[PDB]
C-alpha cells in the first residue's frame, strides 16, 4: 500500500493511495486500487487487467470509479457533479515509442448545486431541461456511453530532466447512440527537447497543447467536459482556470444580468510554451543533474465556440479565439532530498478582462 | 486567540423606515486564505435567505432582487473584511443579518458556506 503527498498553487493539498498486485492467484490479471484527493476532486478506482488478451501482446482492461468535483473550489462558477462509470480499453502496442488505445465506457453524472449562468442553461436548453434561473438548489443526472481511444508518441533520451527528444498524446472520445449526451472530444498534447550545445545542458522546450468538443445534432458538449487553461501546468503567471469565458449570472428572486470574473472554462482551448532551459549558474559542479533551470513564455486560449454575442452584446464575445494570453517568466525544479520541487516567477504581459494574475507559483511532492 | 474561523459582525440597529444603515464583517484572527464573503439574513417569520456576496478578488457582485438598487456589498482595504450599506431601508429589510464565508467561487446556497457569524440585528420602524 504506496502513498504520496503533495502541496501547491494549482491543486492545493494532495493525497494518493495504492496498492497493485500482479498475477492475482496465479490466474495472469492484475488488480489494482487507486485513490486521490485534491482541494476540489476526490477520486478513487479499481481496476483488473489482462495482459495476455491476444499473445500478440494486446491487453484488454477493465476499470471501475468514482469522481467527485466541487467546482466552486476549483474557481469555477458553483456546480457539483459527482459522477461514476466503467471502462473497458484495449491497448495495442506499435513499436518502442507508439502504442494506441481503443476502449468502452459507461458514465453516469448527477450534477447539482447550479449557480444559473447564460452559457451552463444554454446547454441544459439543449438537453430540454428548463431549470429555473433563480434557484441553485437544482439536479441534472446523465447517463452516456463512449468509444474512447488513444495515440502515445514518446522517444524521449531519459525520463527525468529529458534533454533530447520527443512526447505526444492524443486522446478522443464519442458518444455512442442511446446516450444522454451526443457530443465528441479530442485533444492533443505535445513537448519537444532540441538540445543546443553538443553537452545537452542548453535545451530549447517546445509545448503544445489543443482541445475541441461540439455537440452532435442540436445538443451541445456537456459544460462538466469544458476545458481548461491558466496555471502551473498551461500558462504560468495566471491562476488555475482564470483564462477563458466568465460567468454571466441569472438574478435572484425568492433582461438584467450579472458580469463576473468567476471562470467558466469552453469547448475549445490552445495553449502553447517556449522555454529555454540552462545550466544552474552557481551549482554547476559538474553533478547538478538535480537542479534544472530555465526561462519560459507562456500563451494560451479558451473560447466558447455556442457563445452568441448578438444577444449579449453588454458582454464580451466568448466566442472570439484570438484573446491570447501571454506571460513570461523563470522557473526552478529540484530533486531535492526532501522531494521533488518546481517553483517559478511569472508576469503577465498580455491579459484580458477578469482574469486573475498568480505570479508565484510552487509544487512539493513527497513520495513513501 | 480562537481556535478556529470566527467572523464577527458590526454594525446594525434602530432605523427608520427611509434610513440608512452599514454592516461590517471581518475574520477574527490571522486566516492566510482569500474568502468569498456573503450576506444572508432571517426575517421574524420567514426562513434564513440570501442578501448579496462578493468574490475574493472583489471581481464579482451579487445580489437578490429585493436589495437590487438600495444595498451595496464592499470588499475593505484589510484582509477578509466585508461591508453592506443598506439605503432607502424598509420595514421588509428587519431581520438578523449573518455573515459567511467560503473559500472558492461564491454562491447563493446557504450549505455551501463554510464559516458563519452571530448575527447582527436589524430593526425598521414604520
Known amino acids: 500500500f504506496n502513498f504520496g503527498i503533495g502541496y501547491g498553487t494549482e491543486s492545493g493539498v494532495s493525497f494518493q493511495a495504492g496498492v497493485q498486485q500482479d498475477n492475482w492467484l496465479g490466474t495472469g490479471y492484475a488488480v489494482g486500487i487507486n485513490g486521490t484527493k485534491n482541494d476540489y476532486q476526490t477520486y478513487a478506482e479499481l481496476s483488473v487487467t489482462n495482459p495476455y488478451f491476444t499473445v500478440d501482446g494486446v491487453s484488454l482492461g477493465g476499470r471501475l470509479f468514482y469522481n467527485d468535483f466541487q467546482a466552486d473550489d476549483a474557481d469555477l462558477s458553483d456546480y457539483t457533479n459527482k459522477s461514476y462509470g466503467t471502462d473497458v480499453t484495449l491497448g495495442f502496442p506499435i513499436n518502442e515509442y507508439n502504442s494506441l488505445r481503443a476502449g468502452l465506457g459507461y458514465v453516469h453524472n448527477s450534477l447539482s448545486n447550479m449557480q444559473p449562468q447564460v452559457a451552463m442553461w444554454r446547454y441544459l436548453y439543449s438537453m430540454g431541461e428548463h431549470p429555473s434561473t433563480s434557484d441553485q438548489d437544482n439536479s441534472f443526472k446523465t447517463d452516456d456511453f463512449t468509444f474512447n481511444y488513444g495515440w502515445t508518441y514518446n522517444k524521449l533520451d531519459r525520463g527525468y530532466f529529458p534533454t533530447d527528444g520527443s512526447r505526444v498524446n492524443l486522446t478522443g472520445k464519442v458518444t455512442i447512440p442511446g446516450s444522454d449526451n451526443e457530443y465528441y472530444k479530442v485533444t492533443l498534447d505535445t513537448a519537444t527537447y532540441v538540445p543546443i550545445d553538443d553537452d545537452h545542458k542548453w535545451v530549447v522546450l517546445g509545448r503544445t497543447r489543443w482541445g475541441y468538443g461540439d455537440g452532435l445534432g442540436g445538443k451541445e458538449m456537456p459544460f462538466y467536459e469544458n476545458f481548461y487553461a491558466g496555471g502551473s501546468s498551461t500558462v504560468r503567471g495566471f491562476q488555475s482556470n482564470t483564462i477563458g469565458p466568465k460567468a454571466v449570472y441569472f438574478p435572484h428572486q425568492a433582461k438584467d444580468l450579472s458580469k463576473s470574473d468567476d471562470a467558466v472554462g469552453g469547448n475549445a482551448m490552445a495553449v502553447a510554451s517556449l522555454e529555454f532551459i540552462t545550466p544552474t549558474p552557481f551549482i554547476s559542479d559538474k553533478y547538478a543533474n538535480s537542479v534544472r533551470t530555465s526561462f519560459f513564455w507562456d500563451m494560451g486560449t479558451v473560447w466558447d465556440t455556442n457563445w452568441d454575442s448578438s444577444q449579449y452584446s453588454g458582454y464580451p464575445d466568448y466566442s472570439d479565439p484570438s484573446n491570447i494570453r501571454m506571460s513570461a517568466g523563470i522557473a526552478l525544479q529540484w530533486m531535492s532530498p526532501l522531494g521533488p520541487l518546481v517553483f517559478s516567477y511569472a508576469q503577465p504581459f498580455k491579459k484580458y478582462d477578469g482574469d486573475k494574475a498568480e505570479q508565484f507559483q510552487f509544487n512539493i511532492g513527497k513520495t513513501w | 486567540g480562537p481556535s478556529q474561523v470566527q467572523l464577527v459582525e458590526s454594525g446594525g440597529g434602530l432605523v427608520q423606515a427611509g434610513g440608512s444603515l452599514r454592516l461590517s464583517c471581518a475574520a477574527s484572527g490571522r486566516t492566510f486564505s482569500r474568502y468569498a464573503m456573503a450576506w444572508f439574513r432571517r426575517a421574524p417569520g420567514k426562513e434564513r435567505e440570501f442578501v448579496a456576496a462578493?468574490?475574493?478578488?472583489?471581481?464579482?457582485?451579487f445580489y437578490t432582487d429585493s436589495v437590487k438598487g438600495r444595498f451595496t456589498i464592499s470588499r475593505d482595504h484589510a484582509k477578509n473584511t466585508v461591508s453592506l450599506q443598506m439605503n432607502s431601508l424598509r420595514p421588509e429589510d428587519t431581520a438578523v443579518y449573518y455573515c459567511?464565508?467560503?473559500?472558492?467561487?461564491?454562491?447563493?446556497?446557504?450549505?455551501?458556506?463554510?464559516?458563519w457569524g452571530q448575527g447582527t440585528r436589524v430593526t425598521v420602524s414604520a
Open positions: 462578493i468574490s475574493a478578488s472583489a471581481g464579482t457582485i
Open positions: 459567511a464565508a467560503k473559500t472558492g467561487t461564491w454562491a447563493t446556497l446557504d450549505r455551501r458556506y463554510d464559516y
